[PDB]
Design a protein around this ligand. Sequence first.
Ligand SMILES: [Cl-]
Ligand SMILES: [Cl-]
Length: 164
Amino acid sequence: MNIFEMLRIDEGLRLKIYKDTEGYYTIGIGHLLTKSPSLNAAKSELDKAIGRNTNGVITKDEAEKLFNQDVDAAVRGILRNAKLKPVYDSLDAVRRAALINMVFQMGETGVAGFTNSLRMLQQKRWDEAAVNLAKSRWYNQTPNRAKRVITCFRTGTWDAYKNL
Ligand SMILES: [Cl-]
Ligand SMILES: [Cl-]
């Protein structure tokens, strides 16, 4: 198991423009296009991202290329973020993957806001951090995914993703 496989399970793969859990235009493997309510604005972002006139549909290869970029960017956002970097550096491989997942989903800013959970992760107080992470909009809106990520923080294993 790895970050790519993990996120592929969490996000799925769709080759046509679609709406995410928040109603935002997205495509591929959870690649957010825009928060604007207009499909045309979404089509425009897509063409700009892919480099061609897409008509809202992409190939698998195209989807995978956006995915590669997005993971890379998440990692880089973590390393450049003063609050996130130290956490990330303190964690083991599985848990680092969990932090990347949250950043991929909610952005560097959103995660950097989980101040208390971050402090707990850094201190390696696993059960306590899992309980704190659950007291969030994130958990209440996407509970199954959140439970999977949280299990990773709690146990340090990929158990929640094995079967899927
Ligand atoms: Cl892009
Ligand atoms: Cl979910």
